[PDB]
């Protein structure tokens, strides 16, 4: 896709799509067990989970199907483990005590958060505002660490162990171009 310079990096909507093409857990409100009825018979996802589904039990579906069922009354999304106060507390403690290493977080960081806060509001066991503020604090400190680490721009390589998709995407056009210019200067000088 040309659109001027949109052929080099990913737009945020593409990032949202690529993140929402991931598995998630679900608690169905209905039952579709076969009589021992139309077959789902999809092509890019296992049907045996959807067809052989009974109410009030745990099963794994893709995120977009979960959202589609959540639009009606046919769903109840289970929040992940890392979206709770007692996990984010130890996480933020880990960033504070370690001033050089990015903490381990899923690469869908901030994105599953945005989607779940926008859509799945009434299923959380914790207040929404507190979790939003703690996520904001996490983003703040990770931004500080990235800004501090950006000062070293070698012409050889660089290492960024635990950056999420959005953080890499919003920084690619600057770091890439600066390092390319440095490489060009060095190569033309030899």
């Amino acid at each position: 896709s040309l659109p001027a310079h949109l052929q080099q990096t990913f737009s945020p909507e593409e990032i949202q799509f690529i993140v929402e093409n991931e598995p998630i857990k679900i608690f169905p409100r209905i039952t579709t067990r076969q009589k021992i009825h139309t077959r789902w018979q999809l092509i890019t996802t296992d049907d045996k989970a959807l067809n052989n589904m009974v109410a009030m039990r745990s099963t794994e579906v893709v995120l977009w199907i979960a959202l589609l069922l959540k639009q009606q009354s046919k769903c109840s999304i289970v929040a992940p483990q890392w979206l709770t106060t007692k996990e984010l507390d130890r996480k933020i403690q880990y960033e504070k005590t370690h001033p050089d290493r990015f903490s381990e977080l899923p690469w869908n960081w901030l994105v599953l958060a945005r989607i779940l806060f926008n859509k799945a509001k009434d299923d959380f066991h914790d207040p929404i505002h507190e979790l939003r503020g703690k996520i904001q604090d996490l983003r703040e400190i990770r931004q500080i660490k990235v800004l501090k680490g950006l000062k070293y721009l070698n012409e050889s390589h660089l290492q960024l162990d635990n950056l999420s998709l959005l953080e890499i995407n919003e920084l690619r056009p600057f770091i890439t171009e600066i390092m390319d210019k440095l490489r060009e200067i060095h190569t033309a000088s030899l």
């Binding site: 990096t9 018979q41 050889s156 390589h157 890439t176 390092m179 490489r183 030899l190």
Partner: protein, 245 residues
């Protein structure tokens, strides 16, 4: 590809190929069999959805009868049609990106094709419609530029494929562009039978690469995102060893 484990594996391969193509600074070969399977799958899916829609429409409009039960009726069809729409969008974006890249490097590819010594041929890298696109576009652009300017241009330099003098008109791809990579490791579940990877302290198997210009050696461990130039990483990319982000 030679056989399918599951259509979802084909979907994953297509997505990985699209991601690799979008950020790569060089035109990559063409996975014919993957889309050969995918288009046929789309054909059957569309045929079956149309057949079932016709069946319900005829049942509903033959007489009053019983209207279709809302349960297990709307949701499956909605899911199939939206999945088909998303897959079509992904294919469309991939094809458009390849078309843009082929538009950019037309003259360089054409010059490379006529070389007999080059082991790479235009047939492998392109689909037939892309070959026809390149041929027609090059011919029409050459005719336009010849009718506009080159007819008044001196014969000694009327050729647009000149590679002599001060500046060359051939646009080679930039192999030294910096790209963001994620070390995927070996695609196999064992991920330890590869004859290239080595070990460091605390295990952590790594891949060792060297920079001919800078005379260095860089360790690439599994599970870390790096920022490395593209020329030294072509083989690892083509072996599904590392994935660009």
């Amino acid at each position: 590809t030679q056989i399918y484990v599951s259509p979802q594996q084909d979907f994953s391969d297509l997505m990985k190929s699209w991601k690799n193509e979008r950020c790569s600074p060089e035109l990559l070969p063409y996975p014919h069999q993957l889309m050969k399977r995918l288009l046929n799958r789309i054909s059957m899916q569309s045929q079956l959805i149309e057949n079932i829609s016709m069946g319900f429409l005829d049942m509903q409009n033959a007489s009053n009868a019983n209207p279709p039960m809302p349960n297990e009726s709307k949701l499956p069809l909605l899911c199939m049609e939206t999945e088909l729409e998303r897959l079509k969008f992904v294919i469309r974006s991939y094809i458009r990106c390849r078309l843009s890249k082929i538009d950019k490097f037309s003259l360089y590819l054409r010059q490379l094709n006529e070389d007999e010594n080059s082991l790479i041929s235009l047939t492998d890298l392109l689909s037939k419609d892309e070959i026809k696109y390149h041929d027609t576009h090059s011919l029409i652009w050459l005719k336009l530029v010849n009718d506009s300017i080159l007819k008044y241009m001196p014969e000694e330099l009327q050729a647009i494929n000149d590679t002599e003098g001060s500046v060359n008109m051939i646009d080679e791809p930039d192999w030294n562009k910096f790209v963001f990579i994620h070390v995927n490791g070996p695609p196999d579940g064992k991920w330890n039978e590869d004859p290239l990877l080595q070990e460091n302290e605390f295990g952590k198997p790594c891949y060792t690469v060297t920079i001919p210009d800078l005379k260095e050696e860089v360790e690439l461990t599994i599970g870390s995102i790096y920022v490395m130039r593209y020329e030294v990483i072509r083989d690892l990319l083509r072996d599904d060893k590392v994935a660009l982000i």
